[PDB]
Amino acid sequence: GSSGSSGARFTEGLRNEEAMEGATATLQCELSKAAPVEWRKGLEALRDGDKYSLRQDGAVCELQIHGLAMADNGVYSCVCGQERTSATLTVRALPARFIEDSGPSSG
Numbered sequence: 001g002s003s004g005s006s007g008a009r010f011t012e013g014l015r016n017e018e019a020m021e022g023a024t025a026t027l028q029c030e031l032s033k034a035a036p037v038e039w040r041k042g043l044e045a046l047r048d049g050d051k052y053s054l055r056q057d058g059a060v061c062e063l064q065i066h067g068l069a070m071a072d073n074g075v076y077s078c079v080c081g082q083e084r085t086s087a088t089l090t091v092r093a094l095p096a097r098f099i100e101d102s103g104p105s106s107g
Contacts, residue, residue: 008035014087025065
């Protein structure tokens with residue numbers, strides 16, 4: 001056994017985010033010092049695979065959510081260890097295609 005306690009504080013904290021529906025949300029947050037964190041949506045244990053992309057450089061954390069939708073909307077929480085920060089994701093619905101006349105965008 002060796003003294004290896006871990007504990008970091010969100011010196012930056014998560015900020016409001018905005019993205020379109022179906023897009024790939026991307027959150028950003030920093031910690032008082034390099035340390036492992038954990039993201040949990042709607043009180044759920046998120047994992048790294050295809051739907052979610054977990055990646056960070058040193059301390060700067062960054063979460064990505066592939067496949068945005070109305071359901072996604074809500075509040076995401078990030079528990080680093082000592083404290084936990086939450087944010088709000090605004091997902092905008094995509095428009096529909098209707099009768100129109102347009103071709104070349106060069107004019």
